Amino acid sequence: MIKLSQPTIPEAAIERVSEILRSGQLVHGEECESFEQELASFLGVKHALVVSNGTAALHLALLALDIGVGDAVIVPDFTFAATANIVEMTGAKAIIVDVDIETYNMDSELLESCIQSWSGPEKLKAIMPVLEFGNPHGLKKYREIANKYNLALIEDAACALGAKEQDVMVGTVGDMGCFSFHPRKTLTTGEGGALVTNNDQLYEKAKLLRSHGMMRGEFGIEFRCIGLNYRLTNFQAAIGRAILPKLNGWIERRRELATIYEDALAPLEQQGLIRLPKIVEGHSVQTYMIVLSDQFNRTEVMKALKEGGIESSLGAQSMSELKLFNHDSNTKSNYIIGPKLYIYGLALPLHEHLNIDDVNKITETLEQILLK
Amino acid sequence: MIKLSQPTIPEAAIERVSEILRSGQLVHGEECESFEQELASFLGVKHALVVSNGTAALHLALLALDIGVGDAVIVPDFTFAATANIVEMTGAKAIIVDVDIETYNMDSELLESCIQSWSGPEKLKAIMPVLEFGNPHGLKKYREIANKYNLALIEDAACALGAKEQDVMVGTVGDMGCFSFHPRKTLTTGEGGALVTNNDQLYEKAKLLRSHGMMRGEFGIEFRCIGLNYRLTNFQAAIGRAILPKLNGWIERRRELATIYEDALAPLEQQGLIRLPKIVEGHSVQTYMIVLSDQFNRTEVMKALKEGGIESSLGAQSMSELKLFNHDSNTKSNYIIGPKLYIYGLALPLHEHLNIDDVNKITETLEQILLK
Ligand code: NA
Ligand code: NA
Ligand code: NA
Ligand code: NA
């Protein structure tokens, strides 16, 4: 069976996890601190905070910017539900903007006009674009637009650790940036995430919120404010630390698999039967999602692929189609691209233990299905 | 060095964690489901949900009962900050009631009069007592009082998995019960927690909130509501599953260490120099906390113990002393017992790898310090 995802925990990491469990040094320790340092250096960013999961990173980002009831945050239509959900878990309203058919990322023009026509009643406080599947495209434009309208930028870089927007690493352009280490993401810690920022106050506040308002004082730990628990275990941090130095190389290889997919599938694209993703420079290829033409029923294609020993799945959700984000601004609107990607987007296997021969099998199976 | 805490991960668990990491089956899986079943059977309760940490269990309990802005929840003065913090993270107000000097648990009489004199403006919705250090005492009274005033009961049983109130397991009397698997708690998963309930709607709602509103529908996963991510990893669940069948036996042994402490220290108690905890039937002895007489400066005692090769620490915090929970009801009040325990409570080593000879050393060192 060719799998969509096959999480890769280096044997070194496995042995280190065993040492930690045996010695009983379990809670956020030197291991988390080191991971944070190592992430910050990898990204070229001032501060990193590792946390329970990528949702927790987005949540702490929101809480650190004091976003909640009476506020609004713009999210993309195409993403995982967590993006829009976590905004509304704070009491703010998720304001949906459609994505671009080429990049699967928030459409920068539709973003700008959404801000221009914003009529309240909530105060628009932030933009939360997704660098979907590892695609950096649009990030500098989001920064530009955010600054123009005096809004915070929160990068939902869940899928995009090690993605690069030209000269600048994804996650380091927003006021804060958020990563997931969920098993389908390329670096995993089972569950895990990271919140990053070049801003000291945002860092210090999120750090308080991550662990019950705790900080080191003159005579030990002081409780400075109300907070949560979104700490990551020491042994989860160790897993992360062992993968990070391999991550760039993993991404290079994934870009090579993408090339092989592009090779095999370009005729089908040219025949108007599918659309391929544009793997720009700096795309980390967390997911390789094609778009089936309307002619094809994705559920049937998936079943046929499965019979031929190939896993596949939808890429992400349409936030408008979920019917959970009920601000007037969303219901009065018609989304085009996200709902389309939701129904016809197809993720194909792409990971660390896929080779040319596998991709060839995948591509031949898809071809026969689509040309029947 | 005699340590306060020495987390015990069975070698079986270590090998199983290694198998899970190597096979790449990481996200909440059969392992979490099995742990939940095994917890529910251990407790004699209908539903269990494992989660990121004990704070997350309290949070989901609050959110499932729809407690937030405009609401109030009664918490004990003596506890870990998370108890009161997580109430206020929902927008509700933490209303503090003092504890009993004998049990370190919410004083049931002061609880009743706090309800009787409650004058708003918020709606009192719940009581969140702590079964502090594994002490079940008071639990049936909390249930009685909650029912009398039509309030929800949320047991903060962070420290009390395997504690028993007569015939009934701690955690199973509240509308919901919450456990921590933090490293200092007897069963640890590094970080981890569990939310339990005999109520189906509370269970189903918390289960939605734990993972982005997700549920199994006709054609796979449906997104029914807004939620969070408080999932526990599969490999953390495995650790838990390996410890649970040993837990009763661990508790029996801790009660034996308590006996040895009581033996050695009763003269000092009788001389009015310390007060010992009452280890009632069903006390799980997560912590063995004595109270120093006012004569003694706990910081100095701790330093002296440390020089003599013995770790020790404060037991918990006073929520009133933190000055974070600013409802009128709390500031207009004077707390007696919690602030005292906060300043003079001293936790002594008690865990799975402490023996009679260690306790003897601890007790002799403490004696010499206190009798100087
Ligand atoms: Na060990
Ligand atoms: Na619509
Ligand atoms: Na492996
Ligand atoms: Na006071």
Which tokens is A196 given? 């990053």
* Environment of ion ligand 3 (residues, CB < 5 A): B 22
Give the annotated binding-site residues of B.
22
Among candidates B120, B119, B72, which has minimal Cα distance to B96? B72
Which tokens is A326 given? 């009920």
Which of A26, A226, A239 lies at the smallest CB-CB distance from B183? A26
Question: Are B134 and B255 contacting, i.e. CB atoms less than 8 angstroms apart?
Answer: no
Cα–Cα dist B317/A274, whole Å: 61
Among candidates B362, B371, B366, B255, which has minimal Cα distance to B1? B362
Cα–Cα dist B84/B59, whole Å: 11
| Prior bond of B121 cis (ω within 30°) | yes
Per the entry, the structure determination technique was X-ray
Cα–Cα dist B155/B178, whole Å: 6
Helices in chain B by DSSP H: which ranges?
A: 11-23, 30-43, 54-64, 82-89, 108-116, 139-148, 200-210, 234-270, 298-307, 319-322, 328-331, 337-344, 356-371
Question: Are A87 and A62 contacting, i.e. CB atoms less than 8 angstroms apart?
Answer: yes
SS (H, E, C) A192-224: CEEEEECCHHHHHHHHHHHECCEEEECCEEEEC
Q: What residue of B is the nearest CA neighbor of A56?
A: B229
- What one-character-per-residue DSSP string does B317-370 give? EEHHHHT----HHHHTS---HHHHHHHHEEEE--STT--HHHHHHHHHHHHHHH
| Cβ-based contacts of A91 with chain B (< 8 Å) | 91
- Check A53 against B52: CB less than 8 A apart: yes
CA distances from A325 to A26, A369, B115, B338 (A): 39, 36, 38, 44
Chain B interface mutation, best of A186, A229, A351, A353, highest count of B Cβ atoms under 10 Å? A229
CATH 3.90.1150.10 fits A248-371, yes or no: yes
Question: Are A222 and A81 contacting, i.e. CB atoms less than 8 angstroms apart?
Answer: no
Burial class (CB in 10 A: 0-12, 13-18, 19+), B238: buried
CA distances from A189 to A241, B37, B232, B354 (A): 9, 25, 12, 33
- What is the DSSP code (8-state) at residue B268? H
How close A186 gets to chain B, by Cα (Å)?
12
CB-based contacts of A317, cutoff 8 Å, min separation 6:
A78, A79, A80, A81, A342, B223
Q: What residue of B is the nearest CA neighbor of A21?
A: B9
| Cβ-based contacts of A230 with chain B (< 8 Å) | 52
CA distances from A24 to B5, B350, B351 (A): 9, 15, 12
How close A340 gets to chain B, by Cα (Å)?
18
- Return the amino acid letter for B237: A
Cα–Cα dist A286/A54, whole Å: 15
Cα–Cα dist A228/A211, whole Å: 6
Buried b (16+ CB within 10 A) or exposed e, A71-82: bbbbbbbbbbbb
Distance from residue B54's CA to the centre of ligand 4 (Å): 28
Among candidates A65, A24, A140, A334, which has minimal Cα distance to B13? A24
Burial class (CB in 10 A: 0-12, 13-18, 19+), B38: middle
Distance from residue A319's CA to the centre of ligand 2 (Å): 10
Q: Please state the domain extents for chain B.
A: 11-97+104-243, 248-371
Give the residues across from B347 on adjacent strands. B289, B313
Which tokens is A334 given? 């018609």
Question: Are A315 and A341 contacting, i.e. CB atoms less than 8 angstroms apart?
Answer: yes
Cα–Cα dist A155/A170, whole Å: 8
| Prior bond of A267 cis (ω within 30°) | no
Cα–Cα dist B269/B369, whole Å: 14
- HSE on the CB side for B268, CA within 13 Å? 24
Cα–Cα dist A60/B90, whole Å: 14
Cα–Cα dist B41/B202, whole Å: 18
Q: How far is CA B301 from the centre of its chain?
A: 26
Contacts for B144-149: CB closer than 8 Å, 24+ residues apart: B145/B108, B145/B111, B145/B112, B145/B115, B149/B115, B149/B124
Q: What residue of B is the nearest CA neighbor of A211?
A: B82
Helices B234-270, B30-43: axis angle to 10 degrees equals 30
- Check B26 against A183: CB less than 8 A apart: yes
Distance from residue B335's CA to the centre of ligand 4 (Å): 6
Which tokens is B227 given? 């939620």
- HSE on the CB side for B275, CA within 13 Å? 14
The CATH class that applies to domain B11-97+104-243 reads: alpha beta
Cα–Cα dist A279/A108, whole Å: 18
- What is the DSSP code (8-state) at residue B134? G
Question: Are A247 and A186 contacting, i.e. CB atoms less than 8 angstroms apart?
Answer: yes
Active-site choice (A93, A125, A164, A185):
A185
Cα–Cα dist A132/A104, whole Å: 6
Distance from residue A318's CA to the centre of ligand 2 (Å): 11
Say whether B65 sits in a helix, a strand or coil. Answer: coil
Question: Are A265 and A363 contacting, i.e. CB atoms less than 8 angstroms apart?
Answer: yes
Which tokens is B328 given? 């009128």
SS (H, E, C) chain A: CECCCCCCCCHHHHHHHHHHHHHCCCCCCHHHHHHHHHHHHHHCCCEEEEECCHHHHHHHHHHHCCCCCCEEEEEECEECCHHHHHHHHCCCEEEEECECCCCCCECHHHHHHHHHCCCCCCEEEEECCECHHHCCCCHHHHHHHHHHCCCEEEEECCCCCCCEECCEECCCCCCEEEEECCCCCCCCCCCCEEEEECCHHHHHHHHHHHECCEEEECCEEEECCCCCECCCCHHHHHHHHHHHHHHHHHHHHHHHHHHHHHHHHHHHHHCCCEECCCCCCCCCCCCEEEEECCCCCHHHHHHHHHHCCECCECCCEEHHHHCCCCCHHHHCCCCCHHHHHHHHEEEECCCCCCCHHHHHHHHHHHHHHHHC
- Return the amino acid letter for B155: E
Which of A11, A88, A324 lies at the smallest CB-CB distance from B223? A324
Question: Are B178 and B195 contacting, i.e. CB atoms less than 8 angstroms apart?
Answer: yes
- What one-character-per-residue DSSP string does B156-187 give? E-TT-TT-EETTEETTSSSSEEEEE--TTSSS
- Check A52 against B52: CB less than 8 A apart: yes
| Cβ-based contacts of B22 with chain A (< 8 Å) | 9, 11, 14
- Return the amino acid letter for B363: T
Cα–Cα dist B369/B300, whole Å: 9
Tell me the residue length of chain A. Answer: 372
- Check B228 against A322: CB less than 8 A apart: no
Cα–Cα dist A57/B338, whole Å: 34
Distance from residue A9's CA to the centre of ligand 3 (Å): 6
The CATH class that applies to domain A11-98+105-243 reads: alpha beta
Distance from residue B8's CA to the centre of ligand 1 (Å): 5
Among candidates B298, B287, B278, B194, which has minimal Cα distance to B243? B194
Which of A6, A59, A235 lies at the smallest CB-CB distance from B24? A6
Torsions phi, psi for B273 (to 5 deg): -90, -25
* Strand duo A317-318 + A78-79: pairing: antiparallel
Residues of B designated catalytic: 185
* Strand duo B317-318 + B288-292: pairing: unpaired
Chain B interface mutation, best of A79, A233, A313, A352, highest count of B Cβ atoms under 10 Å? A233
Which tokens is A5 given? 């995802």
Which of B26, B86, B225 lies at the smallest CB-CB distance from A324? B225
- Return the amino acid letter for B244: L
* Strand duo B71-76 + A345-348: pairing: unpaired
Torsions phi, psi for B270 (to 5 deg): -65, -35
Structure-token match 């990070």, residue found: A244
Angle at A300 between CA A298 and CA A305, to 5 degrees: 95
- The radius of gyration computed from the CA coordinates of chain A, to the nearest angstrom, equals 21
| Cβ-based contacts of B86 with chain A (< 8 Å) | 228
B11-97+104-243 and B248-371 share one CATH topology?
Answer: no
Cα–Cα dist A147/A141, whole Å: 10
Cα–Cα dist B110/B138, whole Å: 12
Which tokens is B85 given? 């913090």
